[PDB]
Design a protein around this ligand. Structure first.
Ligand SMILES: [K+]
Ligand SMILES: [K+]
Ligand SMILES: [K+]
Lengths: 195, 195, 195
């Protein structure tokens, strides 16, 4: 079997990786690293708490989640950006020009959600890279599906990506997990190789 | 014994649970989820840093912790709401109407506290549910004691709770762990079943 | 070998320690605990994102990291205070008068950094204690080196420290890991024994 010491080594390693933003890959969409949403180029924000703000009011500290939230690591319940319906988009200016190799999408865990369901989670999505900074023909880097039955954090690797580099990428949500009124995005990450 | 692979499975599971807000239960008192303190119905806030703000001054960024802090997940030392003396209360409007089944109270760990003592931690407390939204006769859901010798995060299950639902609950602190001047509350959670 | 139950005990203990600010020692430099930078007595702040703020602009929410950041626990990439060149300093008023026994310095992990390099990390540094509150002769508590090949969080114990107590200490950076333009500090902690 294993020694008590080998267990400790294993646990140490697992916690080291846990503390490296869970997945151990640099995130070029991270706002604190220098990334930003191009607000001009995102879906309109939807307020998911209209029912509570209508019945009890609008707190003096309250503000709607803006697209910036998808580049922020706090993913406690409600710290997600929502748009109306099952299709939406956000364009991100990365902190550096990179050759993109993967993205990560995460949603609140079922265990922290009412009735253990996350129907507002994104489902099918696609990633586009914008060479010039202009609402041009974005070029598809890949198409994926966030699995509502999978782990909260899911990483998607592009299949045979170009050597092409980008500093602007679009997250395009095409379907959601069935919520008939909105979709919300807890955090979006972009990984790749810089210069 | 156990295989190295079984150790890895165990560690993975433990970290998965760790990342689900430590205890894996939805929190209906979580401010980001839509909950709020009814400021009208809380004890007066006590400033625990009067000695430091009197000798060195009031920073241009400094503000007193308000009751909202008990619905916020940052529990680093000092990120607690304090009231004067050993008895106090806070009333919370939950993010949803639920049948309440448990609460969670947590305090800073002894190891992060001066001299490994947490005398300002709450001790005896009670939980009341308010059916109508009016400072009425709250109805006692349960009485418990936060153990200063226990784990920092402690969860308390109601014994034979009604099927009755509430969206307003009061945390009533009745004793503290001996601090002669105030009690402070790092985080309060409410669990249960919604609709 | 070990039992599956003993593995669980080990994992529980490791996670308990992980949750105690990783290292299980009280931090008297922690801003939320009552500590503060003496802004009058820090190096001038350097903006590391001048290239991005010049090409894309200055966001309506954007602000430069100030020395306060080294007393704040968020250490995601970019949540560090930078100064120009490889030598710099910051003076901290601790939350309590203590006999200092150790300090902790941490930097972003290589795995979250472009090209797995952290050349702006501090290298050689020294810690001074200031008895009177006046830019006096600080008295050297110890000299250390942050290892860029070590763990992200590194703790340094003073060798034969006095029984002397202080509430003001200076972190003096003397070298960095080779970045020719600035050094940045993610988080600085001070440990010791109070009254
Ligand atoms: K977020
Ligand atoms: K809190
Ligand atoms: K920091």
């Amino acid at each position: 079997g294993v020694t008590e010491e080998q267990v400790h080594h294993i646990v140490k390693q697992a916690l080291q990786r846990y503390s490296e933003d869970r997945i151990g890959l640099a995130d070029y969409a991270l706002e604190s690293g220098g990334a930003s949403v191009i607000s001009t180029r995102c879906s309109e924000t939807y307020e998911t708490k209209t029912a509570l703000l209508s019945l009890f009011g609008i707190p003096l500290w309250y503000h709607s989640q803006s697209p910036r939230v998808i580049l922020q690591p706090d993913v406690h319940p409600g710290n997600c950006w929502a748009f109306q319906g099952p299709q939406g988009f956000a364009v991100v200016r990365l902190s550096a020009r990179i050759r993109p190799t993967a993205v990560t999408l995460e949603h609140v865990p079922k265990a922290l959600s009412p009735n253990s369901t996350i129907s507002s989670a994104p489902k099918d999505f696609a990633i586009f890279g914008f060479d010039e900074d202009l609402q041009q023909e974005g070029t598809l880097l890949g198409k994926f599906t966030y699995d509502q039955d999978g782990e909260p954090i899911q990483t998607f690797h592009f299949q045979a990506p170009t050597m092409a580099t980008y500093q602007v990428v679009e997250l395009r949500i095409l379907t959601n997990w069935g919520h008939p009124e909105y979709t919300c995005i807890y955090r979006f990450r972009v990984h790749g190789e810089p210069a």
